[PDB]
From a paper:
GRs mediate chemosensation by forming ligand-gated cation channels. However, some GRs do form functional homomeric channels, including D. melanogaster Gr43a and its [name] ortholog (Bm)[name], which are selectively activated by fructose. As anticipated from its homology to ORs, each [name] subunit contains an N-terminal intracellular S0 helix and seven transmembrane helices (S1 to S7), with S7 broken into S7a and S7b.
[name] purified in the presence of d-fructose yielded a 3.98-Å map, which we used to model the fructose-bound conformation. At the bottom of this pocket, the fructose-bound map contains additional density when compared to the agonist-free map. While the map resolution is not high enough to resolve the fructose binding pose, the location is consistent with published mutational analysis. We are therefore confident in assigning the bottom of the pocket as the fructose-binding site and discuss it as such below, although we refrain from describing specific fructose-protein interactions. In both a superposition of the agonist-free and fructose-bound [name] subunit structures and an alignment-free distance difference matrix, we observe agonist-induced movements of helices S2–S6 that reshape the binding pocket. S2—with its highly conserved D99 residue closest to the fructose density—moves the most, and most helices move inward toward the central axis of the subunit. The Q443 side chains thus create a hydrophilic ring more suitable for cation conduction in the fructose-bound structure, although the pore diameter is largely unchanged. In addition to its twisting along the helix axis, S7b moves out from the tetramer center by ~4 Å.
Residue numbers in the entry:
A (entry chain A), B (entry chain D), C (entry chain C), D (entry chain B): 16 to 230, 283 to 446
Write the structure that this text describes.
């Protein structure tokens, strides 16, 4: 297949991250894309090594006494730190170990999306992807800064206790697994949002049909037809993406619920003791901010897609009300008016949950319960 | 745009409340309405000042010892009082700081609503708004009385402890923020309910089409068409209002859940100690009544709108069953019978929750859990 | 209006119960029915008196010491007994004080139901009501027996402690309020289930249209039309009943959730002490059975109505698949196939909850939480 | 009726398990099937005997002191062991005591399924059932191994304490009831999944209609009709199966929620004491795995059926978009496009819950609450 503009860049990031084993060749505005068996094998080696190192680190930190373990001063702290580490190793594992199938899925649907773009204004439509890439890359940079600053803070806790080398080798795996699960989450928030921008362009191309019939190189008598076919393809591609991501997309939500449990637990315990550990207190608040912003980066592209859905259901009904009775346009709008009832576009990871924003009301409805219930066992 | 009747009065209230930066000019039954940049800047100054004063008050009350702090006798009381104050400052802030965009939204949809009223019986239709205004203003008067009586009670607690000036300056901000969030909530319960009354008038204008065809200046062959167009416009306007309010409409619900947690906590603790503080006990019960009545003033206009929805789905199906087969009326009723399946009228703030009355079953399903869980940490 | 068969008997029960202020005159198989202002005033007097007596009883039992109060041995026992009494006084009050409007609703919809029965097999269709009455009356008899046996047990606790007269006058009101709320709940479970039996008869009258067209005094070309009109009327009547009952129908569910909290609390505390109070232990288990069976008598007629709904959606689609293309029957089946998408028949009290059986999964999902949370405060 | 291929084998298992009282006669690839009154009476005797023996065992283990009761060392352990046993006796009872009606249901729907298969590729379609049987039998073998290993472990606990005969006779009933409820659950996961495979074959037979019209012994003008009739029959059969299983299908889910409460309770208590009981610790973890895998064997065939549903709604809309306007194929696709809106295929046991995979999010949302709440009462 062919990738045009910044989608090539976000995939290049996922490739060096081992989340997209793609080999590609340059073009004047594009890259031709292929799977490499070697890059798959490299990615499996890399993440298997980093998962082994992360588990070996967790085992070492469980073995070292609570006296020396600068964030694991008690059994309960060991339990919550194990929760912090382990589900991120789960998300990293189940994410990358599916990566070849996810890229088979992308190499399937992207040909259809290119065929759709060939009618829906592909000309300069890449500027939308350029803007979305420029916006989204800044999130990964911000997280990289925060992760490094976290490791530097714990490295200072190690240095002030004389244990730098061991606390380094115990966590350098875990931090890189965090970075990998961030790259997976951003890659989802890119693909599902470029598809949303294409839906927006389709929707405006339909909207101007309303003015064309009230008063675009073919009459609405044909244009509504060909747009309804594109409105089929731009559903099938959404169900492709929702399936190819559905497993890590739900695992990362479960891991983020667990982190929104574990991080406030630390914040509260570390302000029940004397607040003198100011750097820790701030770093944990910035982590709580990241553990919310990541969830908002998961759910926002879905809500902004389903709003394009609802606005298409609006503008079709406007057009259907203006269109003259019984003429061919009326029948083709009938076709579209049923299509919008059958092919409802919506992400749902493994079908396990409706990924619209009510998911945040549900997840916070769990977080606020479980945080308090868990704290109650500390005292 | 133009505002006729008491909608001008409720907007005038919101204007002096700094929730609607509208400049308007009088007419024999109406006002012409415009945004003023000066009234925007004034509103931003006013609410920024009152939020600064409210935070400065909360900081002062946290600084003053629990001995002298007549409702903050312990750390837990300080925590729950901070919850009481702060989310009301959040609602006031996020409410007013969006006000110019909300009035841009109103100045958009109200022209379409005036165009709809030009066909749906705008003649004397203002009496519905007059009645709704007369009913709703009494709620704001009642709340103003309750708020003043609360401040007078705490001022008496201050006077009997010799601390009147400090307890005054610590809370005069907070009370005015409460008043502002009440004005925002009432303004929603006006706009979303005037739109409901217009839906009712549309629905009756359709209902009498059933008698007209069984036996309104044009045949049903045209009237059902033009009504179906109005039935599009009276959906688009609902999605405009639901979006322009959606953010403060959900923040105020979250704040009201938090108050239905905090206020019963006070009531229970202040009846676990000796009930001699009769004025406090009554005032807190009246606050619990207000914290329920406000939520009912949020949800009731939605439920009474969706009941007009359901009754329109009923009466259309009556009309469709009587209408003769294959004649033009049958096709136009087909159009309407699909429109009612696509353009389902319903509020949903930011889409985050279905604002129908099942929301109260959900929110009380949370309140009764969290109140008990929180009390359990006191003892 | 006119009431035929056992519906007259169940209304006669509700009339002597003061839940249906109907004056009626006999016919050879029917009664003519009217509202009496005198029977309304009598019912308001009766329930106002019994609510005053029940509150006066609760006040007396709160005044008498826990030593003598044979089921109120502690403050917590007083709190849960107050919960037991008070929401039943709420249900009795809000039930009966709406009774005239509920009978206005019945005197409205029953004329339409008689008009429907005039086509859908009203001839001997009363035998369904006869069977349903015979079944449902046995539930009220069983509850009357259980209530009397409860009062006799507590009267024996009073006699063995020498306090019979006071414990009698403290509870004789409460028991009669329980009986009134049982009569209200049964009356709902009669009306909503006779309407279900009429839906079943309609559905079979449609089903045999499938054989008539595959091979009922008019061709399917007309019969499906007239049945679709009846299928409108048998929705409008359901929305009438669901609204006229919706308030006490939801209050009684909330009261039954509260009783499924309070009664197991007694059962557990009274088996944490020595089980020697065998009669009490059995009587409380029989009460827990009644507090489940009442909820099942509320929800079952709804689930058995919506199953007739779903089976009508099935059999219409069978008929639509056999019917020949383009002939008039195809258009009339199109009409019906949309009607089944718009006029979905379902009860919902005040819209506050979907009264289908998932309600029991939701309510038990609350009961099992709140029972344990409440017990945790006892020790 | 007639059963072809491995469905005969899974029914033969259920017959020796007393869950399917079928008498059958062999054919070259099939068996003719009948109910036997004798096999019904035998099954009622067998399960009544084993329920009596299981209750007698539970009573004996409650009678024997906590000193000797190798998994019932305290009252709380007796309570949770009673929960472990009793709801499995409930599931076994309510399962088998309905078995004749369930086989009446099967002997009804299987004739229609054979009639459908006569058009949808029944030729070699049995290989799908062969594969599904080969896969599913391995689950019952695995569970049999685990159950035997559990009984052998407890028999060793008995032998090392000299009490082998009594601990044998106290549990040999319970284990066989576990095996019976496993056979019931697998039988559901066979029937509901063979029906899914038939839906898949139907769906592909429709899909190739898209290529046939773009370019199967009759034109799409007929084929889409006859397929839409089969698409009715393959809904009616699903509602038959969902009803005939709905009661034990929901009871077994409730029992599995209760086991996911009770088993982690043991695991946690038996790791709060010293872990030396390694065999117990492993066996309880393998039980927790089984208590998850059983629930996944319940829900997975539903989710994989509703995905065939959604993919049929997709491919119909593809076909409807290609089909030429106004020709007969367009009307027959209109028929199908409404049928997919009315006859939505989905299991729901007793309607009490949507059995799609969101059920696992709901049930784990309960499990994680109730496990912690219950543990909190231990200490
Ligand atoms: C941005 C705020 C988003 C909250 C919007 C209002 C929530 C509506 C609601 O009432 O949902 C509740 C969410 O629980 C909750 O309060 C948890 C949400 C946070 C509010 C309560 C804790 C205070 C937060 C500071 C409970 O519902 P579910 O049991 O189904 O989960
Ligand atoms: C006016 C009363 C409105 C209540 C109507 C019956 C509630 C139906 C229900 O069963 O919903 C329950 C609401 O919880 C609840 O009892 C909380 C609602 C209040 C009832 C329980 C506390 C006693 C109130 C005095 C739980 O459901 P969700 O977990 O989804 O939230
Ligand atoms: C007849 C039994 C009916 C139960 C059917 C299975 C329940 C399905 C389920 O998982 O729903 C759960 C119901 O809670 C529950 O266990 C409470 C239902 C009772 C089961 C748990 C306690 C043991 C009962 C003895 C939780 O869901 P919601 O939070 O939305 O309320
Ligand atoms: C495979 C993991 C499946 C979990 C998928 C994410 C769950 C989405 C969610 O947020 O649902 C929550 C499920 O509760 C829950 O965390 C319980 C699910 C397990 C996650 C929390 C405990 C840690 C598990 C180790 C709460 O919702 P409901 O109150 O309606 O029930």
């Amino acid at each position: 297949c062919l990738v045009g503009g910044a989608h090539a860049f976000i995939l290049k990031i996922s490739s060096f991250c081992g989340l997209a084993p793609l080999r590609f060749e340059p073009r004047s505005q594009e890259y031709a894309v292929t799977i490499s068996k070697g890059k798959c094998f490299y990615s499996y080696i890399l993440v298997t090594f980093l998962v082994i190192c992360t588990i070996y680190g967790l085992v070492a930190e469980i073995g070292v006494g609570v006296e020396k373990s600068v964030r694991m001063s008690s059994r309960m702290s060991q339990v919550v730190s194990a929760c912090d580490i382990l589900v991120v190793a789960v998300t990293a594992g189940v994410g990358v170990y599916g990566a070849p199938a996810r890229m088979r899925t992308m190499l399937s649907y992207m040909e259809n999306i290119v065929a759709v773009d060939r009618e829906l204004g592909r000309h300069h439509s890449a500027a939308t992807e350029r803007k979305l890439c420029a916006l989204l890359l800044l999130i990964l940079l911000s997280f990289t800064i925060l992760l490094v600053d976290d490791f530097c803070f714990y490295a200072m806790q190690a240095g002030k206790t004389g244990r730098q080398w061991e606390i380094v080798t115990n966590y350098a795996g875990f931090y890189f697994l965090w970075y990998i699960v961030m790259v997976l989450e951003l890659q989802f928030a890119f693909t599902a949002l470029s598809l949303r921008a294409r839906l927006k362009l389709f929707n405006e191309a339909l909207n101007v049909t309303a003015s064309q019939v009230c008063k675009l190189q073919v009459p609405p008598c044909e244009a509504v037809g060909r747009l309804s076919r594109m409105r089929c393809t731009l559903c099938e591609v959404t169900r492709h993406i929702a399936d190819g991501y559905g497993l890590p997309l739900v695992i990362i939500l479960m891991s983020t619920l667990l982190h929104l449990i574990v991080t406030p637990y630390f914040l509260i315990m570390e302000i029940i003791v004397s607040t003198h550990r100011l750097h820790f207190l701030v770093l944990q608040f910035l982590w709580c901010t990241t553990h919310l912003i990541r969830m908002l980066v998961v759910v926002e592209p879905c809500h902004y897609t389903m709003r394009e859905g609802k606005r298409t259901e609006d503008i079709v009904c406007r057009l259907m009300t203006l269109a003259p009775h019984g003429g061919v346009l009326s029948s083709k709008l009938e076709v579209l008016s049923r299509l919008l009832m059958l092919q409802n576009i919506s992400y749902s990871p493994l079908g396990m949950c409706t990924l619209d924003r009510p998911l945040i009301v549900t997840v916070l409805g769990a977080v606020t319960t479980y945080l308090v219930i868990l704290i109650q066992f500390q005292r």
